[PDB]
């Protein structure tokens, strides 16, 4: 029992196998060396471990290891890719197009670039979170140098057609960046086919450790960015600093694991997700945010009408979930939900350790909770005539 | 025996206690929560651990927890403090003063600011590595907004009078940043007294894990910087991104340990360092780069004259050390050493697990190895008339 964790999108637990691998690269009896120490064995062994992990990450997304730049997380990756490309190609233009539902790491980076003189078009998504590709194309100009649209949304799990957006960008000579923190290891990614130029990844959203991530930077056709972190020109000049070996080994192991169990795990999560939805879609006034069909298999975001969101989370004390509110979720607001519905919205994000028992328990707890509140709810009183 | 590790300045092993604390914040059965998840217990517990570590770090350096900003390492801390303060106060001036012997994270950051329109004065150190404060003083102008001089040099261990430098800066209203990555936990630091406004710290140089660090940002008199990492306004708007709890717990425990054992360990290292130098200082043409009495108690950088540096490292294969070459060390070159002598220089850095047994073995190996090299050395032949 205990507080059931259904907030995997916020962060996931490190896989035991990842944890045990990481432990081998920390203490004095392990490979604790600095890979930058080129004159001795401690460094050589550390460097080898990094290369193995860099290849493991690359294998998952069908990339060349040299295209993988290590960062401290997907936030830095997002900052590096957008600020990096925006600054590098600014002579070609200063227009950037993105989406209003992007993660803050993308939105706040674009806001900073706006104060630096760049122009940013924040596209509004359709009611279901999907970006109208026609509007995207209409927004593109001769001075547009970059587009950033995420693969899977962290709040509602909607999936964008990154392959198609990439096509549109390559044809116009526009750099395309994808924040794939919520899709890597869940949805198939093959950059040998995909026309994406920059792609952000993280470790802790796929059972790896927090504080590590990577940025895919296409080698062919060659894409370039200005490093945002200086001090040695590490990572082929794109990101300076000491390589956190144990963190890097953990991310690699996490990505090796994902490649192998992805197919079976995702089909499993999709089943638990539908199970959850089927068990509550019948509740009087409930709305699903996104698309329980093409969206991510592990995310379920639903709004419960005629209930004070302020007390919803308290009602669901037995569940560790999220509402998105910081002010209500800006993603839900971008979808068109009013402040009240947005507040009384819950995101259920499933993971590797979620079971049917938990789901059925959750289904029950939700129906009952929504039932009680609605009884002693002045708002619901209003609904029923 | 095996390759004796005398490269503690490049990186240190994670202390066993640090490693065991970290392991409790990774897997499903431990505190794996995202501290940013404010609606449930997994988040709350993680937040508590972070706050505990933030205090442990602040206590070592005499700061307030609120002045500690978490970063991915000292490289990022250096980037954040300098780019952050430069951009924030640019309307008051764009002149920055630093030292030619600073770590690359400071130098390459200053180089980037230069192409962005900032003016940087790189002061040359004295023969012994000390910055002549009168020269620093003469370089300060009314439009000088920032100074960055490190506490302990990573290559030669020389110590700068940061207290006096801080006084000079505060009196002129200049922001003073100190890269204290090699001094924290080794030399006493009390920010409640020290007139330093920004200070960089790392974890893996003081037996903590790689990939984690912090930036001290003075609260009173209030100092401010522009964030370089966007996405949520975390760390009081100064550094966005997920807080890597297991990493932060580790740095905290590492700083807790350093506060407790600093006095006893530093005296021990000073003894071993002195033991090493005494055993080789009598070798024909050997020179100590830095200062034997005031320099850091764990770093010994020596040059061996009239000997090809190319064979030096190999000859000392039984030791894991560094020559600081990339091209010879730029620090040594800044001290006035010719390219050849700089190349034939070795940096010995000691730590928590170094023993007198290792030092004595090192002494013998150095003497014998240097004698053998000089036996067949064309350079030595020239010298011997
Ligand atoms: C979590 C997340 C990020 C930020 O990840 P980092 O590793 O945590 O800092 C960025 N984008 C998306 C879509 C995310 O879910
Ligand atoms: C190692 C070091 C740095 C960089 O440290 P990070 O944790 O490794 O990236 C900066 N300054 C000094 C003086 C150092 O010794």
Coordinates of C-alpha atoms in Angstrom, one line a residue, chain A residues 45 60 62 103 107 112 115 123 172 175 185 199 206 221 223 251 271 308-309 330 340 344 356-357 363-364 374 380:
Chain A
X45 CA 39.7 3.5 -17.3
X60 CA 18.9 3.9 -28.1
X62 CA 20.1 5.7 -33.5
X103 CA 8.4 22.8 -20.9
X107 CA 9.9 28.7 -22.8
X112 CA 15.7 35.2 -22.3
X115 CA 15.4 40.1 -24.3
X123 CA 2.2 28.7 -31.3
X172 CA 13.5 25.3 -45.4
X175 CA 17.2 24.0 -37.5
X185 CA 13.0 5.1 -24.0
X199 CA 17.5 16.7 -29.3
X206 CA 13.8 7.0 -17.6
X221 CA 24.1 17.5 -42.3
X223 CA 24.8 21.4 -37.3
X251 CA 22.5 7.2 -17.7
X271 CA -2.7 -1.3 -20.7
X308 CA -12.7 22.8 -5.9
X309 CA -9.2 21.8 -7.1
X330 CA -0.1 26.9 -18.1
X340 CA -11.2 26.4 -12.3
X344 CA -9.1 20.6 -10.5
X356 CA -2.8 -3.4 -11.8
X357 CA -3.5 -3.6 -8.0
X363 CA -9.8 3.9 -9.7
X364 CA -11.8 3.2 -6.6
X374 CA -19.1 16.8 -5.1
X380 CA -21.4 20.6 -7.6

